Design an enzyme around this catalytic site. Structure first.
Site, PDB file in Angstrom:
ATOM      1  CG  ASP D  31      43.373 -34.130  69.877  1.00 35.54           C
ATOM      2  OD1 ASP D  31      42.907 -35.044  70.593  1.00 35.54           O
ATOM      3  OD2 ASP D  31      42.719 -33.591  68.970  1.00 35.54           O
ATOM      4  CD  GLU D 123      46.312 -35.586  62.470  1.00 31.47           C
ATOM      5  OE1 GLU D 123      47.017 -34.557  62.562  1.00 31.47           O
ATOM      6  OE2 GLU D 123      45.876 -36.194  63.451  1.00 31.47           O
ATOM      7  CD  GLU D 132      45.073 -28.170  57.023  1.00 29.03           C
ATOM      8  OE1 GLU D 132      46.173 -28.738  56.773  1.00 29.03           O
ATOM      9  OE2 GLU D 132      44.646 -27.991  58.173  1.00 29.03           O
ATOM     10  CG  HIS D 280      43.658 -30.880  66.743  1.00 24.00           C
ATOM     11  ND1 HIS D 280      43.371 -32.227  66.659  1.00 24.00           N
ATOM     12  CD2 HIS D 280      44.613 -30.646  65.808  1.00 24.00           C
ATOM     13  CE1 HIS D 280      44.096 -32.774  65.696  1.00 24.00           C
ATOM     14  NE2 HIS D 280      44.856 -31.837  65.163  1.00 24.00           N
TER      15      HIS D 280
HETATM   16  C1  LIG Z   1      45.596 -15.732  60.335  1.00 23.44           C
HETATM   17  O1  LIG Z   1      44.573 -16.626  60.837  1.00 23.44           O
HETATM   18  C2  LIG Z   1      43.960 -17.382  59.925  1.00 23.44           C
HETATM   19  O2  LIG Z   1      43.505 -16.943  58.898  1.00 23.44           O
HETATM   20  C3  LIG Z   1      43.903 -18.818  60.320  1.00 23.44           C
HETATM   21  C4  LIG Z   1      43.287 -19.714  59.445  1.00 23.44           C
HETATM   22  C5  LIG Z   1      43.207 -21.048  59.757  1.00 23.44           C
HETATM   23  O3  LIG Z   1      42.615 -21.960  58.936  1.00 23.44           O
HETATM   24  C6  LIG Z   1      43.746 -21.551  60.976  1.00 23.44           C
HETATM   25  C7  LIG Z   1      43.687 -22.920  61.341  1.00 23.44           C
HETATM   26  C8  LIG Z   1      44.221 -23.367  62.531  1.00 23.44           C
HETATM   27  N1  LIG Z   1      44.162 -24.736  62.892  1.00 23.44           N
HETATM   28  C9  LIG Z   1      43.700 -25.776  62.123  1.00 23.44           C
HETATM   29  O4  LIG Z   1      43.756 -25.787  60.894  1.00 23.44           O
HETATM   30  N2  LIG Z   1      43.179 -26.802  62.833  1.00 23.44           N
HETATM   31  C10 LIG Z   1      42.621 -27.989  62.198  1.00 23.44           C
HETATM   32  C11 LIG Z   1      43.685 -28.930  61.660  1.00 23.44           C
HETATM   33  C12 LIG Z   1      44.188 -29.904  62.707  1.00 23.44           C
HETATM   34  C13 LIG Z   1      44.905 -31.111  62.141  1.00 23.44           C
HETATM   35  N3  LIG Z   1      45.871 -30.738  61.123  1.00 23.44           N
HETATM   36  C14 LIG Z   1      46.315 -31.599  60.189  1.00 23.44           C
HETATM   37  N4  LIG Z   1      46.442 -32.873  60.420  1.00 23.44           N
HETATM   38  N5  LIG Z   1      46.642 -31.100  58.974  1.00 23.44           N
HETATM   39  C15 LIG Z   1      46.932 -31.923  57.811  1.00 23.44           C
HETATM   40  C16 LIG Z   1      48.358 -32.379  57.849  1.00 23.44           C
HETATM   41  C17 LIG Z   1      49.391 -31.593  57.660  1.00 23.44           C
HETATM   42  C18 LIG Z   1      50.800 -32.022  57.678  1.00 23.44           C
HETATM   43  O5  LIG Z   1      51.150 -32.562  56.387  1.00 23.44           O
HETATM   44  C19 LIG Z   1      52.060 -31.695  55.733  1.00 23.44           C
HETATM   45  N6  LIG Z   1      51.703 -31.621  54.319  1.00 23.44           N
HETATM   46  C20 LIG Z   1      50.569 -31.069  53.782  1.00 23.44           C
HETATM   47  N7  LIG Z   1      50.516 -31.121  52.473  1.00 23.44           N
HETATM   48  C21 LIG Z   1      51.697 -31.757  52.122  1.00 23.44           C
HETATM   49  C22 LIG Z   1      52.243 -32.122  50.878  1.00 23.44           C
HETATM   50  N8  LIG Z   1      51.643 -31.893  49.704  1.00 23.44           N
HETATM   51  N9  LIG Z   1      53.444 -32.744  50.878  1.00 23.44           N
HETATM   52  C23 LIG Z   1      54.044 -32.984  52.048  1.00 23.44           C
HETATM   53  N10 LIG Z   1      53.626 -32.681  53.280  1.00 23.44           N
HETATM   54  C24 LIG Z   1      52.438 -32.070  53.250  1.00 23.44           C
HETATM   55  C25 LIG Z   1      51.978 -30.366  56.484  1.00 23.44           C
HETATM   56  O6  LIG Z   1      53.145 -29.563  56.318  1.00 23.44           O
HETATM   57  C26 LIG Z   1      51.799 -30.882  57.911  1.00 23.44           C
HETATM   58  O7  LIG Z   1      53.002 -31.368  58.503  1.00 23.44           O
HETATM   59  C27 LIG Z   1      44.831 -22.455  63.396  1.00 23.44           C
HETATM   60  C28 LIG Z   1      44.912 -21.128  63.081  1.00 23.44           C
HETATM   61  C29 LIG Z   1      44.375 -20.635  61.866  1.00 23.44           C
HETATM   62  C30 LIG Z   1      44.438 -19.269  61.507  1.00 23.44           C
END
Ligand SMILES: COC(=O)c1cc(O)c2cc(NC(=O)NCCCCNC(=N)NC/C=C/[C@H]3O[C@@H](n4cnc5c(N)ncnc54)[C@H](O)[C@@H]3O)ccc2c1
Ligand SMILES: COC(=O)c1cc(O)c2cc(NC(=O)NCCCCNC(=N)NC/C=C/[C@H]3O[C@@H](n4cnc5c(N)ncnc54)[C@H](O)[C@@H]3O)ccc2c1
Ligand SMILES: COC(=O)c1cc(O)c2cc(NC(=O)NCCCCNC(=N)NC/C=C/[C@H]3O[C@@H](n4cnc5c(N)ncnc54)[C@H](O)[C@@H]3O)ccc2c1
Ligand SMILES: COC(=O)c1cc(O)c2cc(NC(=O)NCCCCNC(=N)NC/C=C/[C@H]3O[C@@H](n4cnc5c(N)ncnc54)[C@H](O)[C@@H]3O)ccc2c1
Lengths: 342, 342, 343, 343
Positions: D31, D123, D132, D280
């Site tokens: 992206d 992010e 989330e 995205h």
């Molecule tokens: C079975 O099918 C479904 O049911 C389903 C359902 C769905 O909803 C689906 C959604 C999809 N895509 C999607 O969501 N797109 C939008 C988001 C795009 C942009 N994303 C972000 N920037 N995310 C935020 C950043 C995250 C990073 O930060 C880390 N992190 C988080 N918390 C902590 C913490 N506490 N400590 C340390 N590290 C942490 C984490 O590990 C990452 O590296 C795809 C498929 C799907 C299927």
């Protein structure tokens, strides 16, 4: 050294540069007839390799040494003169065989081996078998072979047969006739037409063909690698007497070769014949300056004389006559400068 | 100990002049109607640059340009040629009754002696990507024989470079290299050589033609003025570039072509090898990046193309390029001596 | 500490039953006419296997198979379902006036109690590549409720494996991984992760369909007889293979499909997910080799496909294959839980 | 910990497993709007990074940390809870930055940092911004921020606007009407039709649309990350009064978001608006169960209430009325289970 004495430096530089390219190794390795037959010959004759000392002459990337290892060789000396030696070393390390395969960079005529070997393996065959004059390096390597030692390949058979190919013959004149014009942008080029024809006729044609162009059963000239000396390959005289199976114009001679790996368990053959799947050796055709008419049941006799030169190749002299009519033809060809027609 | 001998390895020179000794190669060049017709048009339409003048033809081959000079009314033409083609040129001069006007001088133009200074030099010194063969230096060296205010044909050369996208070309070269990824080629792990295989394949400039729709920005032009340049200027050629991207996508490398101009008293005539123009025997040349760079329309792609002359009558090419907006960078080293003909 | 809970991580179970709670998913399955129509044909054409019999429906979903059992004259049908779909099944049973014959029992079949033994068990326990979801074990577990003479529908399952050539499929997965080759992605060298990216992409089995002309040898068949098998038999599944190559070329991996047979008293009815047959919601499954193997026609390609059950209701797949004539070998490890849906 | 207390284990397992895949990192990295804007925000505000201490919350592969390094950061702590942490470590070594970027595996609520930082980068934005619940982890991280300290992004604006999309509305009924048949292989399904409609309407729709469907200027809800506390995001009340620019049926509300990086040198915006190139994050639409007719010049007023749940998402309650007629509509949606409609 023996190599340096029989080889011009300019030829050697270009030669080893060519064999330095991974792309060339890949080309050879992708020939399944070549790679697969060598593997079968070695593995199916495992008792010729099991706990034995081996010399691999001109190992390239090292494939044959790895086959020797798979068959249980105690030690394998892999000699290679091109920069491919360094890539072979890398593969030996990456395959955890540093204890069994020892890469020795240099010409096999110049390097020293610590000990005598039980068996020599190599792929010394060029176009028409003899081109590159590597068969001499292979034979030279027998100074490192124990008494009753073996060689893989053990023998090589060169095959010659007369062919008819009107289109191939006529093509030489069509190309040369570019020069037979009185005003090419105002310039008369006609005086060079004969010289162009001569030039095209010096070149052996590397190509494949349908076996229906062959006019007689082949004549076979055999080199037994166990018995032959380097010297035997400096002047190669191949007499022939062909019994014509079909009537027509004979435009020249076609060449191919087989080698045999004569092991204790079995003999395995690698053929480059036009009856067999195409290899990276193709086949070779030498034209006559003038075609000879023969009838079925005539004999076409003469000699093919190969004279080694310092450019790691041969000057080819072919004389042939139809005995029944006395019609005669010659040609002189430079094997170093082939025309790749395929 | 001449200038040619000092900058050229003997093994390279032997092979080079041997190649240009073949009538088949002369025919190949002469049959390029764009090349032969344009040279003729340049010379004949500028007849007052030749009428009763003394001419030097550097690397004349069969002599065609000298015959054009003669048709345009030259008093005397010295035609220098180092290959055995010199003798065939002599034959043509006699057969065309021009012995009074065209004097063939066998040898390197760096080594031979001319009896007098000339009014104009003519030559076809351009190789692949203009610079290959390093004959531009022999052409410039020949200016020691040029009178003050003497002219040169061609007068200037423009090299053009432009970024291209060609996924199929990239994948082809990558797919070939990936042969060396296999962990078990007849039981042998080749993967340790995969990086080296990629380097080898990507080091080869690709000689062929392409649709202009692959070009992603207006070309950048590097000009050599043959009237002003010295031999020395061509030992190290630095070409800066700043491309303004007209389309978004992956940039797989840089494409190269060249034009030359014959700047005569009556008119200027251009010979172009551009992809917008009919195909010539120079085709065009593409240098791939090992990894493509993503750019958006309106980004700038800047860097340098550095050509370093070597003793094999060619150049080592260094290309460094970056997308300024993101700092995505690619550097690549290519051997112009070993092109891939597609 | 039921049998289900012991072999299944809670986080996997939660997500799994949540997925099967959605009416949209039921609709997807029900709209597969090959699936729904064949189950109906198997049951109705073997009506004497159901007439006045007691039936267990394992993982009944909306209840469709129970309704088929009722149409075929079953005295009583226990319909077990662990997802919230159980409540929707109850609604349908009432609305179709079958409360006297179909009894919905919410819960895992490993945990619920049934009041009596049954004459026949019916289910749709097949996942992708047959084994995915590990529901075959729940189906086999249910045999504790089966009378001695009792039958099972389906009765047997055949998994089919065959080698395939598909350069475009191979290059697609490779091309995606090669994103991680770049030495300067916005000035950052990603190439150290390239090997890991390739592993990740090639670990995914590819779920879609293909023309049968990509198959390079007759399939090898592994049969599970549901009447005879024990749950334990499915924890480690070893499938040896020796393919006789019918065509020369690069073998890019192995293709998998399955058939099940309903072996009734009146007739045997087959449900096939083969690529020669109309497409089902099971499609077919392909496991790629990280590096393709070259074979000639008349070579043998031998090895083993080893499926090891994991706590995420799926299998770790190990494929080892070699061309016997050359000794060219490929081994590959795939995560059946995370398939790539390509269709 | 704070993370564990507000999050169900089953949700956390699945969540971090998802973010463990290189394929997901690649998706985000490709992206160009996202990656390019973050790079521009950081590099063009180089004096906010030059010789400073940085915390990167949820660093994934580490790309933002590498941007911080390019801008001259003395030290960067890159925190990541998924198995991606190990891949980030590999990249830090391969890029010879082990002296400047320190990867710390774990939840930012649980790990320890040796020192306070000058600036936090992350992010944390999900679908509709809030999904989330990572915004809370981002705000939680301020315990490590020095008094003068900055945050990148600095603020987030959620935009809501009413839309008309007859085809999107009608599509829900067409899908549900699968169940409105009296004899599906002999079974009357109609009793489940209402339940199917309810299920489809609980799902927010993730895709993009032409801006010509929007019937009024957007209303903006701003979260200032410098000032906000974790607690502020547990219950988010967004009042709205839309002045209708066009007459027609209002089928629901559309959502997008912008974030701003407020640096010392300049402010850089990252927008997911439908007027801007697609990201995205797409956009999100919540349907009304029943559409509201409004005339141009009417006011459409109500509230969007987001209530945080233990599945790292929100229960969405939307109530709206046309003030001039008193026609009212509600909907309740599960943000955790969106319908991805984009084709
Ligand atoms: C079975 O099918 C479904 O049911 C389903 C359902 C769905 O909803 C689906 C959604 C999809 N895509 C999607 O969501 N797109 C939008 C988001 C795009 C942009 N994303 C972000 N920037 N995310 C935020 C950043 C995250 C990073 O930060 C880390 N992190 C988080 N918390 C902590 C913490 N506490 N400590 C340390 N590290 C942490 C984490 O590990 C990452 O590296 C795809 C498929 C799907 C299927
Ligand atoms: C004047 O210019 C021309 O007219 C010219 C110029 C060209 O270059 C041309 C090239 C052409 N190419 C082409 O199609 N060739 C067919 C080859 C097919 C069959 N290949 C082989 N099996 N080769 C034999 C194996 C050799 C290996 O053994 C190593 N080795 C050799 N000697 C020693 C030694 N003493 N010690 C240690 N190691 C040694 C060597 O390095 C290799 O690894 C065709 C025409 C040309 C015309
Ligand atoms: C796989 O195998 C390879 O690796 C390989 C590699 C390759 O690169 C290959 C390249 C190929 N063809 C090629 O290049 N095409 C483009 C050029 C077309 C137009 N050529 C020129 N106008 N050239 C310049 C004109 C020179 C004339 O001037 C004479 N001359 C030169 N110097 C002097 C001097 N100092 N004094 C006096 N006379 C001199 C010389 O004798 C000539 O008569 C084909 C095959 C290849 C295979
Ligand atoms: C995030 O992306 C992924 O990672 C992912 C990964 C994936 O795998 C995905 C798979 C997808 N779809 C799919 O697979 N389609 C075709 C294959 C399904 C064919 N249907 C079946 N016959 N399955 C088995 C039947 C089960 C019924 O039985 C109930 N049941 C089970 N166990 C018990 C028990 N112990 N007790 C009582 N009741 C039980 C259960 O609740 C059901 O009602 C779609 C998306 C995906 C995304």
């Amino acid at each position: 050294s023996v190599f340096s004495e029989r080889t011009e430096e300019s030829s050697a530089v270009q030669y080893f540069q060519f064999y330095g390219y991974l792309s060339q190794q890949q080309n050879m390795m992708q020939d399944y007839v070549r790679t697969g037959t060598y593997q079968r010959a070695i593995l199916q004759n495992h008792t010729d390799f099991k706990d034995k000392i081996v010399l691999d002459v001109g190992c390239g990337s090292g494939i044959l040494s790895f086959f020797a290892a798979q068959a249980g060789a105690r030690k394998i000396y892999a000699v290679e003169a091109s920069t491919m030696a360094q890539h072979a070393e890398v593969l030996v390390k990456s395959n955890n065989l540093t204890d069994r395969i020892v890469v020795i960079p240099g010409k096999v005529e110049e390097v020293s081996l610590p000990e005598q070997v039980d068996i020599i393996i190599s792929e010394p065959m060029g176009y028409m078998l003899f081109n590159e004059r590597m068969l001499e390096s292979y034979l030279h390597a027998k100074k490192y072979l124990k008494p009753s030692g073996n060689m893989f390949p053990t023998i090589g058979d060169v095959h010659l047969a007369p062919f008819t190919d009107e289109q191939l013959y006529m093509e030489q004149f069509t190309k040369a006739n570019f020069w037979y014009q009185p005003s090419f942008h105002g310039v008369d080029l006609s005086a060079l037409r004969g010289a162009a024809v001569d030039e095209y006729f010096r070149q052996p044609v590397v190509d494949t063909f349908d076996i229906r162009i062959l006019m007689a059963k082949s004549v076979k000239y055999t080199v037994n690698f166990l018995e032959a000396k380097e010297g035997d390959l400096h002047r190669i005289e191949i007499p022939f007497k062909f019994h014509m199976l079909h009537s027509g114009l004979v435009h020249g001679l076609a060449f191919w070769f087989d080698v045999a790996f004569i092991g204790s368990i079995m003999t395995v053959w690698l053929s480059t014949a036009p009856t067999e799947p195409l290899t990276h050796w193709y086949q070779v055709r030498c034209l006559f300056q003038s075609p000879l008419f023969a009838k079925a049941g005539d004999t076409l006799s003469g000699t093919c004389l190969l004279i080694a030169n310092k450019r790691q190749s041969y000057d080819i002299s072919i004389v042939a006559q139809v005995d029944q009519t006395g019609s005669k033809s010659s040609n002189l060809l430079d094997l170093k400068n082939p025309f790749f027609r395929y």
